[PDB]
Symmetry: D2
Subunit: 295 residues, 4 copies
């Protein structure tokens, strides 16, 4: 392994070009983003054989300072004319490889810093403020991109992946976990009606990477919509396990978004212990599942 | 100082009696709580001269186990027939002092564990789910109560305080900070248009402690409403400082809720550094303000 | 209430004057501090009735910017010629009130950012490095000070307290918790041999605030020595509860340090649940706690 | 992908067999582990094509409950008779695949929960306590193992890696960063004497996985020794960058431990900003990082 970079590059841009014309779906009201406030936390990693001597000899001749990568990212957010994190990452990746010809590969993560609307009384009635927003520490969209320079000097995206992270859902009834292996190590009672509490990270890949950029918004898959699919399917389903639930969420996502190639899940179980029904937090050990549905 | 207790007593109650009939205000749509899911994190502290020898002699004869206080709280959430955290704390405080006659004083904190509604498609249309909720790591209501046993053996609430914690608001324009002292220690530039980013903890006290309990919902002050007042006033105000803003929020709260005696603010400044306008996270040091408005 | 200030003012100073000349105790080998690296996190709060219109009218004429307070703290750490956080707080407080005559009161917290020594081989032997240090996220020393300006423009310290925070101690055996109330709310079993795990925050107050500054270091009480007393007493004691333990720790402290007026304890219970060798695991979140003062 | 498992399986064992008989190096006084208290946080992942219908049809017939995996881990810590996290992981992995024949692969992480010794006075002298320990939130040792079941029901380790995580080192002087690219994106000034502060995660892989278990302890590589090498090399070196430093640390490691095949580094830059004595303060959040492997 040989690479280096800069993490936690927070950047806040006001009045980015709004995202409009997004194809809606029955599970979600989402149609676009106003982009009055556009926050993203970026991580950049770059590699290339010519970086070797910066490690082996302490030769900094070919080192773009990691501090300079932060400048690069933040300046490019100022000049980005697109409408999505995915497109911003492509802009950064392309501009960076174009600028630094000794770099063979660049990997980017972009994590949304989400802000929610708030109420203000405008003259006489409540409405959404166009100035005051609430910082949310809940779920947030993500994006990932890897781009390489080929031997013929062309630039190629080798990997792209969008996601929703930090979604925490509890369904008070309509969940079971029964029929699992009962042997010498099994002390968990069967439960025909548990308040299943799951953390979800959902990530998707497009059949055609262009669709991720939002240029044709009709083909863009929004994390807001993925969220509302997850909650909708959770509501509709008499779950039989987390495994069972996330497969059904995945199938619905692929059905709603045929331009997607796959959906990947990282789930955790945080179901409370039962002790009017009252519950309490469990001990720290948490179950998890990881699973890919493909189109 | 001599007291002891139990903290992080999480308790989750389903289908608590709903809170209804709350007097509304122009800044907020709030009218009640469905209480399908009622989460609270409780801290209990108890004191009394008769506890001395548990410290000085290792005599546990008069020690209610802190583990038993957790049981006490969680069982009482199961039997609570009221509608607010404030009333739940009074129920716990009264029942505890009634049960343990060697305890002279009890202090309680109750912190809401908030859950937000989610979308589910019911047959054909999107609607709020009655089963699936989203755990929120954003702002949350709080409550505080101190109750003592008097020499004549009556029980008296000596202190009560409700609050909203963890509110994080950023207003992209319409804020200034100018005219402050410029001397040998001053390097901050004046700013006539900054994206003021403030954290708020807002706490209020009632003229009549009965109003906090929600028995007559007409007199109850909801944290949801305090929130929407704060965002509304933030929107309306060309702020001149955080100090200036929180005074104006306080005045509005007292005007809307004449049954309140005071409002107390704990604010922090997290305004981003400026570097299309792009900003970034500042260094760690944060300003703060603390201030009480009284009716 | 009315005050404002600045928090999380981290400041790292190199080559502060060493602390030496301290008085030893049986429980502790502590003999001083090198101060190659002296890290402190500072929080400052100021008050004064002349600040009212900064709230009520948005008038910043008498506002020291909280950004300026950060500059003030860090610049005074560069010029500080003493040897303790406690003395540093007094330096900042007195300088600040002298500088800003409309401020009537100032409160300061300083929390050590501790660093530990590391090994290095040089000139044929291994020894502690004078250059490379390890940042510790374990326990740390604390200091608190409040100072007011009187009507006649004199300044007075009105409260001072030192401390040790974040001490996390587990004793594997030699602890019991029995004989507590067993009623309808009791499911905890009696346990004659538990592996008591306590978090400890220990704070002390001096009879004479001057002893806190280090200027006559033989009268200073070091957080390192307080830690060592805590661990020794825990080892020595067949504990009957955390309450029992902390009273005993506080008595030894006031016995070892007759210049102290009182010691205050904030303890939390984080004892593991028991599940061949003995194995334990982390408990559910709810934690017991105790708060208790021992006085001379 | 398809797998499921259990994380944050904390487990604390008393009086595990001591680790002794290890081979020393100049950089480190490490000579073994007492194991009065042996804490580990374990994460387990399992896979197998026979798990598909648990996802696609909600059929739990072949689901080992993740709750049961936690029980499995903790019970095997009680019966484990070895001396390392690495050997413990192999014990759990082999037992689990033997128990559950439909599982084809298992991956395990174990992270040390470290505890430090404390002082206590007894029988007329002060010495380290055999009962009271201090929980450390600083660096800790790690271990990773993956094991698969072959078609013929044999089991094989397919990957093994040990490590040290959370090492936080600041060197106050004797570090430079100069000569990097200065273009339109460069605002960082050249600095010939900076107080380099690095976070280090160091992982190593053995030529022979058996050497990782402790069974012949003279061939074991201890995280404690790796730490000491890291700090020594940092002290010794006039660093020209973090990149420069970590390559040098990795070469010394592979020189000291010829039984290692490779060492891998994850470093982060957390160097303070400079603001009488020298004073520094915490930087803005963005942090540089490096990832690099040195091989024999
Ligand atoms: O949904 C679940 N899947 C599992 O594998 C499991 N194991 N314990 N509880 C569980 N719940
Ligand atoms: O609103 C503010 N109040 C203050 O006191 C201050 N100081 N720096 N920035 C500030 N902003
Ligand atoms: O030391 C203890 N004190 C207590 O009050 C207590 N309550 N439960 N366990 C306890 N342990
Ligand atoms: O050691 C360093 N390596 C780097 O790549 C770098 N970039 N900015 N500062 C740096 N320091
Ligand atoms: Cl001594
Ligand atoms: Cl040696």
């Amino acid at each position: 392994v040989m690479y280096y970079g800069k993490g936690d590059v927070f950047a806040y841009r006001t009045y980015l070009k709004p995202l409009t014309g997004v194809r809606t779906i029955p599970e979600s009201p989402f149609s676009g983003r106003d982009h009055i406030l556009f926050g993203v936390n970026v991580k950049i990693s770059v590699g290339g054989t010519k970086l070797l001597t910066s490690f082996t000899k302490g030769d900094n001749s070919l080192v773009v300072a990691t501090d300079s990568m932060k400048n690069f990212i933040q300046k490019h957010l100022a000049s980005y004319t697109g409408t999505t994190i995915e497109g911003f990452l492509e802009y950064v990746a392309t501009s960076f490889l174009k600028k630094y010809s000794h770099i063979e590969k660049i990997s980017l993560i972009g994590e949304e810093i989400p802000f929610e609307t708030t109420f203000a009384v405008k003259n006489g009635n409540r409405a959404a403020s166009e100035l005051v927003f609430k910082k949310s520490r809940n779920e947030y969209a993500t994006a990932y991109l890897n781009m390489v320079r080929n031997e013929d000097n062309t630039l190629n995206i080798t990997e792209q992946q969008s996601g929703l992270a930090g979604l925490q859902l509890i369904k008070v009834s309509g969940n079971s976990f029964v029929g699992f292996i009962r042997d010498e190590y099994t002390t968990l009672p069967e439960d025909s009606n548990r308040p299943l509490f799951v953390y979800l990270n959902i990530k998707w890949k497009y059949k055609n990477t262009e669709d991720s950029f939002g240029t044709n918004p009709e083909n863009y898959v929004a994390a807001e919509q993925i969220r509302d699919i997850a909650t909708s399917v959770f509501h509709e389903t008499e779950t039989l396990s987390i495994q069972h639930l996330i497969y059904l969420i995945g199938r619905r996502i692929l059905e709603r978004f045929p331009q997607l190639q796959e959906v990947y899940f990282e789930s955790q179980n945080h179901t409370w212990d039962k002790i009017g029904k009252v519950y309490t937090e469990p001990r720290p050990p948490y179950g998890f599942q990881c699973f890919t549905v493909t189109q």
